[PDB]
């Protein structure tokens, strides 16, 4: 199966309906957890089955361990190759903020897009994937700011 | 029952739109995976 | 966030 971002999608609901997002790298799909529930997903005629998941990170990676390592520099402007239900990927450039924590500092992304845009890749200007959009919190002004979300390797 | 779909390349994108602010803000990650607001 | 919440 063909390294990129895939949708992925449901017929459980009504139509056709996309609940996500992810990356295929190094044989290896890369998703968030509340997005398939560690549930088993189809590639056309073949069956990915879980791997590794974390409800914590909210993070899975399926046919293998978690493949992306890259991470954002502190400093740079970052791309989040948003891919929203019904509409082509289109990449947006942004300079991240930061979730400040009791654990450490993590960059986070100040952009709001429907809720099957879960697991869309953020890009460093090399094109690695650097973390995934989709777990973040709602501030005092009512906008979403998620956590670019990265596994270890 | 869940399936995938290709949608594109991971790559950088020359002339893409800049947006979005750079907040930084005091968060708080609990068992459920929920961020919140300190 | 959408229907997501903050999902």
Known sequence: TTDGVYRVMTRRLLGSTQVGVGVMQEGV???????????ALRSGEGRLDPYW???????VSYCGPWKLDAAWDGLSEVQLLAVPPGERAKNIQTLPGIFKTKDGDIGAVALDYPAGTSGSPILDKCGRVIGLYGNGVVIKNGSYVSAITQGKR | ??????????????????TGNSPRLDVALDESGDFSLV | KGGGXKK
């Not at chain 1, 799909?29 to 549930?39: L, N």
């Not at chain 1, 998941?53 to 993070?59: A, I, M, P, R, S």
């Not at chain 2, 029952?1 to 800049?18: L, S």
């Open chain 1, 29 to 39: 799909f890369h998703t968030m957890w509340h997005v398939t529930k560690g549930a």
């Open chain 1, 53 to 59: 998941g974390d409800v914590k990170q909210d993070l």
């Open chain 2, 1 to 18: 029952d869940m399936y995938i779909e290709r949608a594109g390349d991971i790559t950088w994108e020359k002339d893409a739109e800049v």
